[PDB]
Amino acid sequence: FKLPAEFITRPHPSKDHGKETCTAYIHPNVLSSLEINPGSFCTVGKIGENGILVIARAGDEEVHPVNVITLSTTIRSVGNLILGDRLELKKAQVQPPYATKVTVGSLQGYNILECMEEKVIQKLLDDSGVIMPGMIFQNLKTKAGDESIDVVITDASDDSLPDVSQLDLNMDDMYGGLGSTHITFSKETQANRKYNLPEPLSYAAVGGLDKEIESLKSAIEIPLHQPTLFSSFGVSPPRGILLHGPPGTGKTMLLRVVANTSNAHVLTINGPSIVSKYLGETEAALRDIFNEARKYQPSIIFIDEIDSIAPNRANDDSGEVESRVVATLLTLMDGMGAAGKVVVIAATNRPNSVDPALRRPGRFDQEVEIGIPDVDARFDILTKQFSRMSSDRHVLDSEAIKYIASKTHGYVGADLTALCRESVMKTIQRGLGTDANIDKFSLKVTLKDVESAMVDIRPSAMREIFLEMPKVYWSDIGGQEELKTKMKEMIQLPLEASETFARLGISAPKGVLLYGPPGCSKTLTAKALATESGINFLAVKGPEIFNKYVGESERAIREIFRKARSAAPSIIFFDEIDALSPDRDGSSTSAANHVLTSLLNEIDGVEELKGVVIVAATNRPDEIDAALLRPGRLDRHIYVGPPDVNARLEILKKCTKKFNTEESGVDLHELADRTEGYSGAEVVLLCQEAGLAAIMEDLDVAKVELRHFEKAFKGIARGITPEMLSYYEEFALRS
Amino acid sequence: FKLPAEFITRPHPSKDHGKETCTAYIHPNVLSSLEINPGSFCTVGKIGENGILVIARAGDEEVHPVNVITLSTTIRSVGNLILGDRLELKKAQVQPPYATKVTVGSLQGYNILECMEEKVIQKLLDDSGVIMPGMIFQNLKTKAGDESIDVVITDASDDSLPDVSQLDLNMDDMYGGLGSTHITFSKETQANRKYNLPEPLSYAAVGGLDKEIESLKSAIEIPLHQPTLFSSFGVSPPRGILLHGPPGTGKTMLLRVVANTSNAHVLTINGPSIVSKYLGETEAALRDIFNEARKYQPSIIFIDEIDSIAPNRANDDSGEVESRVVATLLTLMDGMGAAGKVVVIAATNRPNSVDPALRRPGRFDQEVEIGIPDVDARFDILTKQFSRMSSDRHVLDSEAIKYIASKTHGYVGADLTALCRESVMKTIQRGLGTDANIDKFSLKVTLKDVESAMVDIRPSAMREIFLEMPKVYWSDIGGQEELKTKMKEMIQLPLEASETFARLGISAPKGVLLYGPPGCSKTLTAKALATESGINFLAVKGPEIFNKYVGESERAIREIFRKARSAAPSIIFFDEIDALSPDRDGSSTSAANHVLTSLLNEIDGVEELKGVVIVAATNRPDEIDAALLRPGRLDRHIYVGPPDVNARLEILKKCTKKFNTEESGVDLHELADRTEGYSGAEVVLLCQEAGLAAIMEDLDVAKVELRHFEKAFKGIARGITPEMLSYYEEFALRS
């Protein structure tokens, strides 16, 4: 009459040996209600995934409640069963025919154990069950050496009639005390891909964000193992961790890894699936799920799509479910206990849509930022996935990996998986079309397939609120020695002299203004400084912050400034400030005025900042208002205009690297002498049509002639009159 | 007590012989629930299709699940029973009266078997059941000569008293070992239209989109037939395929043909019919159907009208049916398994209504897009439609079909079927009203009826995003030789110099500007490019993109840009920019500014487009954005002014082909010299008005008179002024 509906997996206590494979502690009332012999096989429905983990069953001692059961540590580890997943119970399966090979695998080991074997097979098949997808057994004590070792029995040659039963449990039959079928020791293979078991994600599988990953691991590890120190402190641990960022970064992988690696209680929710039309039933279900959550002392609660389940009160009062469930959740979330052990983490797509009451300092004062992967993160992801499918399928040098990673600038791990999948699919289809069903191993993976995948992938993440501009070394950029010394000085002052600035009292001017021709000295200088400094740098455009909605630009500027503070002491930079700055001559809407006032308050409004230094670049000198041109802010000015000879030589030799200089015969000096009146963008375009004039003559060319350079020099006018030079000079002298 | 409602169909396994006609695996409880003899006939409700498929029934072995049923591949083929349709149970009907003919048809072959017949009557009539619409049996082994044949028993002359049953099942009676009347083998007729049984759609039913249907078949067959290679790769092969295009292109028949071309299980939905007033009922049904589809390895999932089921999250937050179903379906789609053998098919008319999060590259990056068929595809579909009922019903020359296809430019396959139906009904009514119920075989189908139906169809809205201009070749366009050289160089550079650009790093300027009079050389050039280059051509009109709705134009621009990018690297042309460029004057709305900044960011902003080429045509270059024309981008400029003497002479020669030049006596050069200030548009206009004046004198004429030409010329002003030419020249000087 009990009619059980859901079951929860539980750890096996007391260790020892016991059954260890077929514990199955279910109350006898459930067994009687299912008209199934207790001394027979059991089932693990776990919602779908046919095979149902046919394992033998036993009985409890009236000490395990019907709501929670156990299904053996090794079985749940092999099946990737998280501790506390939803479970059902159905009719058992018929007996298997026989077992064929049962071959050891020796996972995470180099094998060659010789005397350390001491008849492993006796312990392997001395226990009932032993399912073929694997079995993890601790080493316990094995002569001198201690240590630990794992075994894998995936490889076999047993065929079962029902194709749906992918688990196809195998029986055990050995003769011994304390002849098999053609021995058991045969090579040290890992889990086979013929059955394609679900690979359990490990620590090495995730990475690329070690700075945040280690912090999250510590923040979830120190309360779950050492609560006595926090209780003695009296401040109580924070019970909530908030995760947010661009979609596709894979925030669920971290929680999945820390759930499958840890042996504590793990439960997950589908979001609004529990929520129904009724209110009392949903409230009762919530109380029941939290009751089952905290009834076990070690537990971790995972919530998905908090923004959807907790809509903002002010944003939209749509109806149905609203902020009263949010309030009751907050009330029950403020009072678990003084010490406590249950820790709940939160992952959301966007933070603004989430109710600000949720992320109060008393509950979520720690913030985890998961941004778009950087170049190093892309290196790590490519390397880890290459190591994941090994070099057997294909081999590729590190040069191609670094080139394809340098091509990627705003790509994400989801995008990288899309590229690899499309490359594999294109390789398969090309092989089928051309080679007429040739062996797939020989075809492998080549660079042109990856290039084609890059061409036709068309990712849906072209618009990003945060831009990670690719980094370039100092060789590409050609600058001036005084300019380089100044840039290095103003990037080394706030990061090294901050310790002595306390006793000095000067701190930093924190004001940098950049003005010059639009040809160059606007983005490459920032790229070089970011590359050399090694600090996190973000790029934001002028028109990008502007939006049709009134107040949207204010939220964007406030949130990017908040990210600037949250991303450690670094350097912030604006691509073009000549849009919001004009307010009187350029008229414009009041949104520009509000943004200007907000940024003025943020930089010099009854506050002070020692970590971040604002850098502004403008196209015109006179477009800035008099409010910005005030002593104490942006006092320093850099000419960064018509650079001297050595910068031109550097940029010309960088652009001429592809071409041959010795064969041309030019000394690379007269070109710079005649080009001294040009700018970077027009120099780049000029060398472009010079190459074009070289190429269309007789198609492919590896040599460029002087006549082509002479023709291209007069093709484009200088486009520069000394009016702007005089204006820049008169703007410089008045400062 | 269980009260079953709906059943499912499954193939009979183990092959062999068994029964092959009346398996009907039914559990004993259902047998007792029908209060009828188990050794008697049963029925298949199949939600309609009166007759209810009266077939004999038997029992299962308690292993076969009660929910599903098996009713033999012959009956599935005869009744078009898709693998997974709803099924209903009902009491048996009246006993079969008698059998009359049972004659073999032997379709898809030339018949004339004789030698290897070996008494087919024995095999056909030794099986219990045998329903008269037809028996489909595999060849198995027939002496030496392997291969396979198909037999159809659609022809018969038996009538049953109840007209509700359209199947009128019969019995078998024969004498032999290892009596009917008038033998069995007779004639070679195809499927009879008297009963008009539904026919199974095949690959030959759809044509003209071979490159699309083959790609779809591959994308549904390699991931399903051989998942072992993908499992070995371990790249999580995609499970879903998206079908998109304009309404009426005929995607539903593609889904039906791919569903019935394979014996695997298929799920079919009826749109929002699954939605119920209970919030939990919908999600419960979704998880139930997902689980039942997953626990059978061979399965295909069909999604119809995802736009209605899944609306935009950020656009329509109506309530109840919201993104919660999207979240739960994504959760189900995430981790059902590793290898799998199930694929999902999703089709919708409007990709815009699809939620942006649902359009992601992580595991749904692959796209299958079908557009408006061209003249070749239309001709192929028309000739296939004619061949469907062959020359017996109607006769038409291939030139008539080609002319009809040429006339059809923007039509769709649904419109083509409407044209065919209109022609048929117009012919029927005309023959009836003309000859007082004469036989329909005399009139047949003529080109006049097709033309009348084409005139009377009156298409509602022939507006699309992929405009298909009429094909125009080289001789139809007259222009200067310099422009021809420039266009040849511009089309030759990308395709035959991409490798050189990659080696040199120059890439391409990807900027083409066309400024000139709006008469000619603006759309005629695009029409010429549409055919002479051989590359896919796209034309977007300025007034067309503008609309009353705010933001719809932006969405259309985004959609067309991503479609052009994803389709293939090709030259894209935009017709007229005068409706959006003048934003600095007249107080233009913010939408135009957003469009301009979006195109500026997507053309040359933190990314490059090495495949496609940006081509823009303008009338007034002074109204373009100041921040749009900069050195290094869109640098190429074409004068493309008024046509010269040669171009005007070519236009006159092309337009004069209708009349006779010898009779008129004009040299086709003096008129061009006199008409020097007229661009191509008003040149063809004056030619048309001269022809009008020529034909108003004595109706049809064979030549144009000089007096008529001079009267037409003197009645229309030149419309040109030296000031605009001087302005164009001085603007070209600065470029």
Ligand SMILES: Nc1ncnc2c1ncn2[C@@H]1O[C@H](COP(=O)(O)OP(=O)(O)OP(=O)(O)O)[C@@H](O)[C@H]1O
């Ligand atoms: N670090 C990574 N390594 C490998 N693949 C990754 C990584 N991060 C993301 N992916 C790929 O992106 C896909 C989607 O990522 P995932 O579902 O974990 O992200 P999410 O942001 O939590 O999800 P959602 O898009 O539903 O919000 C994964 O299935 C995987 O293919």
Ligand SMILES: Nc1ncnc2c1ncn2[C@@H]1O[C@H](COP(=O)(O)OP(=O)(O)OP(=O)(O)O)[C@@H](O)[C@H]1O
């Ligand atoms: N290519 C074609 N060849 C022949 N008949 C066609 C073709 N395209 C459409 N038709 C006709 O038009 C009808 C409409 O097509 P159907 O009902 O299959 O919808 P669909 O076009 O796939 O759907 P939707 O309107 O959602 O795009 C077909 O039943 C058929 O009679």
